[PDB]
Design a protein around this ligand. Sequence first.
Ligand SMILES: [Ca+2]
Ligand SMILES: [Ca+2]
Ligand SMILES: [Ca+2]
Ligand SMILES: [Ca+2]
Ligand SMILES: [Ca+2]
Ligand SMILES: [Ca+2]
Ligand SMILES: [Cl-]
Ligand SMILES: [Cl-]
Ligand SMILES: [Cl-]
Ligand SMILES: [Cl-]
Ligand SMILES: [Cl-]
Ligand SMILES: [Cl-]
Ligand SMILES: [Cl-]
Ligand SMILES: [Cl-]
Ligand SMILES: [Cl-]
Ligand SMILES: [Cl-]
Ligand SMILES: [Cl-]
Ligand SMILES: [Cl-]
Ligand SMILES: [Fe+3]
Ligand SMILES: [Fe+3]
Ligand SMILES: [Fe+3]
Ligand SMILES: [Fe+3]
Ligand SMILES: [Fe+3]
Ligand SMILES: [Fe+3]
Ligand SMILES: [Fe+3]
Ligand SMILES: [Fe+3]
Ligand SMILES: [Fe+3]
Ligand SMILES: [Fe+3]
Ligand SMILES: [Fe+3]
Ligand SMILES: [Fe+3]
Ligand SMILES: [Mg+2]
Ligand SMILES: [Mg+2]
Ligand SMILES: [Mg+2]
Ligand SMILES: [Mg+2]
Ligand SMILES: [Mg+2]
Ligand SMILES: [Mg+2]
Ligand SMILES: [Mg+2]
Ligand SMILES: [Mg+2]
Ligand SMILES: [Mg+2]
Ligand SMILES: [Mg+2]
Ligand SMILES: [Mg+2]
Ligand SMILES: [Mg+2]
Ligand SMILES: [Mg+2]
Ligand SMILES: [Mg+2]
Ligand SMILES: [Mg+2]
Ligand SMILES: [Mg+2]
Ligand SMILES: [Mg+2]
Ligand SMILES: [Mg+2]
Ligand SMILES: [Mg+2]
Ligand SMILES: [Mg+2]
Ligand SMILES: [Mg+2]
Ligand SMILES: [Mg+2]
Ligand SMILES: [Mg+2]
Ligand SMILES: [Mg+2]
Ligand SMILES: [Mg+2]
Ligand SMILES: [Mg+2]
Lengths: 169, 169, 169, 169, 169, 169
Amino acid sequence: SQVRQNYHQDSEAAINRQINLELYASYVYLSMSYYFDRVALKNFAKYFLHQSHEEREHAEKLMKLQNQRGGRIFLQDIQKPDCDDWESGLNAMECALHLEKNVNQSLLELHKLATDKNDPHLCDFIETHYLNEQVKAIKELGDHVTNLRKMGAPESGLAEYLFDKHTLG
Amino acid sequence: SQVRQNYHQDSEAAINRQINLELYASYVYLSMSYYFDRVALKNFAKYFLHQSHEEREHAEKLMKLQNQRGGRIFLQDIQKPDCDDWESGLNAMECALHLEKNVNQSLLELHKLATDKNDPHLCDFIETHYLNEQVKAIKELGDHVTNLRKMGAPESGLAEYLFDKHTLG
Amino acid sequence: SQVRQNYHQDSEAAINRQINLELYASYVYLSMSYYFDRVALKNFAKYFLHQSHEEREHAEKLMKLQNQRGGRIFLQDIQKPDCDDWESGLNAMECALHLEKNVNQSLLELHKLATDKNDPHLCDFIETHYLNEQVKAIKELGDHVTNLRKMGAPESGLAEYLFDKHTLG
Amino acid sequence: SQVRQNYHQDSEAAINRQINLELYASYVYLSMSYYFDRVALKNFAKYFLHQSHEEREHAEKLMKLQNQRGGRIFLQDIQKPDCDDWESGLNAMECALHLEKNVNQSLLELHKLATDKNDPHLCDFIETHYLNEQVKAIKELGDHVTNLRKMGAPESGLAEYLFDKHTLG
Amino acid sequence: SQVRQNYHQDSEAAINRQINLELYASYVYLSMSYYFDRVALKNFAKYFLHQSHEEREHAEKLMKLQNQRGGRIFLQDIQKPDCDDWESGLNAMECALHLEKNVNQSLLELHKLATDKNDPHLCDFIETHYLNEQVKAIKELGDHVTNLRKMGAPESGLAEYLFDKHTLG
Amino acid sequence: SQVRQNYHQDSEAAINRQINLELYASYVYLSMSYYFDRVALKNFAKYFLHQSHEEREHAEKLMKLQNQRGGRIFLQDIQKPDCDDWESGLNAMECALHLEKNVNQSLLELHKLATDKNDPHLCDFIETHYLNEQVKAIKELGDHVTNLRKMGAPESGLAEYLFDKHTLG
Ligand SMILES: [Ca+2]
Ligand SMILES: [Ca+2]
Ligand SMILES: [Ca+2]
Ligand SMILES: [Ca+2]
Ligand SMILES: [Ca+2]
Ligand SMILES: [Ca+2]
Ligand SMILES: [Cl-]
Ligand SMILES: [Cl-]
Ligand SMILES: [Cl-]
Ligand SMILES: [Cl-]
Ligand SMILES: [Cl-]
Ligand SMILES: [Cl-]
Ligand SMILES: [Cl-]
Ligand SMILES: [Cl-]
Ligand SMILES: [Cl-]
Ligand SMILES: [Cl-]
Ligand SMILES: [Cl-]
Ligand SMILES: [Cl-]
Ligand SMILES: [Fe+3]
Ligand SMILES: [Fe+3]
Ligand SMILES: [Fe+3]
Ligand SMILES: [Fe+3]
Ligand SMILES: [Fe+3]
Ligand SMILES: [Fe+3]
Ligand SMILES: [Fe+3]
Ligand SMILES: [Fe+3]
Ligand SMILES: [Fe+3]
Ligand SMILES: [Fe+3]
Ligand SMILES: [Fe+3]
Ligand SMILES: [Fe+3]
Ligand SMILES: [Mg+2]
Ligand SMILES: [Mg+2]
Ligand SMILES: [Mg+2]
Ligand SMILES: [Mg+2]
Ligand SMILES: [Mg+2]
Ligand SMILES: [Mg+2]
Ligand SMILES: [Mg+2]
Ligand SMILES: [Mg+2]
Ligand SMILES: [Mg+2]
Ligand SMILES: [Mg+2]
Ligand SMILES: [Mg+2]
Ligand SMILES: [Mg+2]
Ligand SMILES: [Mg+2]
Ligand SMILES: [Mg+2]
Ligand SMILES: [Mg+2]
Ligand SMILES: [Mg+2]
Ligand SMILES: [Mg+2]
Ligand SMILES: [Mg+2]
Ligand SMILES: [Mg+2]
Ligand SMILES: [Mg+2]
Ligand SMILES: [Mg+2]
Ligand SMILES: [Mg+2]
Ligand SMILES: [Mg+2]
Ligand SMILES: [Mg+2]
Ligand SMILES: [Mg+2]
Ligand SMILES: [Mg+2]
């Protein structure tokens, strides 16, 4: 590649792995969205559909980065989510929180690699477009979990209904 | 399901298979798009990115249909595309044409099943939202293949450059 | 905390210390502002009041960060400023310069800690919202000191009057 | 001071004490605000942040008064609030009510002093800018306490959630 | 300097060297622009003139940085470009690509120095204003080279003419 | 050159020398500008930055002329200015006046050459775009020197401060 410069093969591979993980997160959220479409919590459905589109954008930005740095995108299967039945609004929020913490850990390992390979452009890319977005998403999901639990979810179906209307609406 | 009516278990399964195929088509087009981003044919890249978003919409409409009819969505892995290197604008257009004819065949088998199970709502759904969209997409890809070949692609890099500017721009 | 991830207890403590320092800086500037209100240099008063509001915003952003990362805010007394009588516009500018260099040193020690604990989100937070703001503030105060000295302050009361009108007005 | 007239040294001192108390109230409300930011009651957080800014304005108006009357501002440490963990929306409202009644008592003692020193300008200043503001704030906090208790707080987390949405939102 | 803080003499010197390099890049692009003005490829001329103005802005931002950090600007001769006759649009694009990779390498060495001297403000400055701009410029020039070669340049004068109209126009 | 007509080789060379001198003047003014940025005379800095951009335009117009007449641009190193520390606003204005008189002398020698070679287009070009611009710039710099001296510069730092505000602001 005539453009490649200071771009380690290990970073290229790690970026391909992160592309797959962002697409996976998009698929999990898509599944969650249509679960809540089925069980008639329309604002849970809207919230997770928006999250799913955001993760596709996350994946696309990494694909652009791979090309910008003179690497080559290598795609892999997007694994299906762990569940098709997400049980409750609270359970889906807890699963999303767990997912985003896992994605954050992968981004931190990616940043450690970029640091170890002295790749400041890649470090800046991760910090600028991913790390604070993860922190905000984790706190937001934590906040939703906190409120749903305090309201009496998941036993209180009234709680999940009112949360759908007042927080996600 | 208290809403399910005249919705055969075989149709439910076939709709889940079609959801996966539409997501697969979306992934193929996403791959094609970023291949052309890499090799600097920006309007090929834009064309296939738009196609990829359209297929995600196709998948989402089938997921909504599954829920509307009282079925249950069962997702599967989204397989990676056959190639990561799509070779040329002409080759990608030929591969997309082949893909859309395969998707059309699956939709026609779906319609045959809905006909065999006397499900006129499902027949109408397929006809209204999928069958003419497929015919239009197949003719459009065929037209692109026809013009690229007539211009001298794929040997003529000038041909693919000018097609990118004048047809896809 | 269900949101806390890669957030060292030492960083949490250092962020609480920085919150206190930003509030302290806000209080110093508030004192300076009303000193110049008393001695009738209204644009010195306006300048330092604006600086005081900016430091409160600095403190609030760190409090938000503490919460975002799953830490806990621990507030301490806000110490009164070193003076109630700031003597002259030049002396107040020199004191503000000294204060901002002290705050900068504390932020650099904070960044060293975040670096030592491999916390790239915290490093980015400090760089993005604090480090260049400090450099700009230090140069601006240095510039004000430079001009006031060149004009003949603090002996020339005319100098401070004209600086109030022409630079701070 | 060439402007000082009918301004007793005891009133000057009492005004300096009141400045400190208003800044203290601002700090208490700032603490309460970010507690509710942490535990995800965003409209409690907004309500107390607004209250904190109002108290800073209260302090600034007294600092302006001190200067207007030819006195000298003497600042003291701003003590940290009694708690960092405010327990519940109800508890924070009860603590704020107690604080505002304490501030009101200090303002009434200030007015008694201004009356005893035959300072009608100071009496009018306190009446015009502070006394009715205190009465309104006390009744408002009392009303919030009344409603939260009637709704079942603090045991009912649903109560505090719905109060956050419907009264503070 | 009363403003200088955590700013190593080696970094100051390296910033002066980078100022000279950015001015040099501006001069190379100015030369390329008027070469294409002479041989009547007006959009090549416009493209490189814009690039030349961008590099002057790059140099000016580093001069501002030098002053902001309490250093002193030391200018050196701006060397003339390697060629006055740039041969072809393709050759100029290849020369610009080589230049931008050389400038990128100098910026990465600058970042390594700022890292070695624990200067996070300087690291952030380089990352924020220079490193991604370099990556984008390198990929863009690589893309132009890729397309011109695929079109048949430099032998095909038609290729360079059409590229001037369709990509740079 | 198929366009060259009545364009002597000596004039072509003299135009290349004038291009270099205009770029040199641009560099001197750029240096002066950032000197005043450093020592906090912001309107001196703005004035000289504008002058520096004007000289780059002067150089570009001569480069266009060289091409228009069928000559060839030959660039040379742009020498660094005589000083990096310009001492005072008055000294910089005196140095700029000296520079512009030197540039004027070179333009008058250029016009003498164009006259000697019976090149009326070149004579008109110099008269139309350069000679009156030089006379205006020389008188303007002379006026600035006159006022700064009358105000008490360079000993009076107040003088330079007020001139920065009232004449250059
Ligand atoms: Ca950065
Ligand atoms: Ca129909
Ligand atoms: Ca960063
Ligand atoms: Ca009254
Ligand atoms: Ca940064
Ligand atoms: Ca004429
Ligand atoms: Cl590399
Ligand atoms: Cl981010
Ligand atoms: Cl059925
Ligand atoms: Cl259709
Ligand atoms: Cl942790
Ligand atoms: Cl900053
Ligand atoms: Cl009195
Ligand atoms: Cl009132
Ligand atoms: Cl230093
Ligand atoms: Cl950048
Ligand atoms: Cl001739
Ligand atoms: Cl003129
Ligand atoms: Fe998200
Ligand atoms: Fe993501
Ligand atoms: Fe399509
Ligand atoms: Fe489709
Ligand atoms: Fe500030
Ligand atoms: Fe601050
Ligand atoms: Fe209030
Ligand atoms: Fe108050
Ligand atoms: Fe550029
Ligand atoms: Fe540059
Ligand atoms: Fe000029
Ligand atoms: Fe000139
Ligand atoms: Mg490879
Ligand atoms: Mg599996
Ligand atoms: Mg290395
Ligand atoms: Mg950011
Ligand atoms: Mg079933
Ligand atoms: Mg496989
Ligand atoms: Mg039947
Ligand atoms: Mg139709
Ligand atoms: Mg703790
Ligand atoms: Mg003390
Ligand atoms: Mg660690
Ligand atoms: Mg920044
Ligand atoms: Mg006294
Ligand atoms: Mg204490
Ligand atoms: Mg009396
Ligand atoms: Mg009233
Ligand atoms: Mg030095
Ligand atoms: Mg040389
Ligand atoms: Mg050090
Ligand atoms: Mg860093
Ligand atoms: Mg950036
Ligand atoms: Mg010649
Ligand atoms: Mg020399
Ligand atoms: Mg002749
Ligand atoms: Mg004449
Ligand atoms: Mg004229």
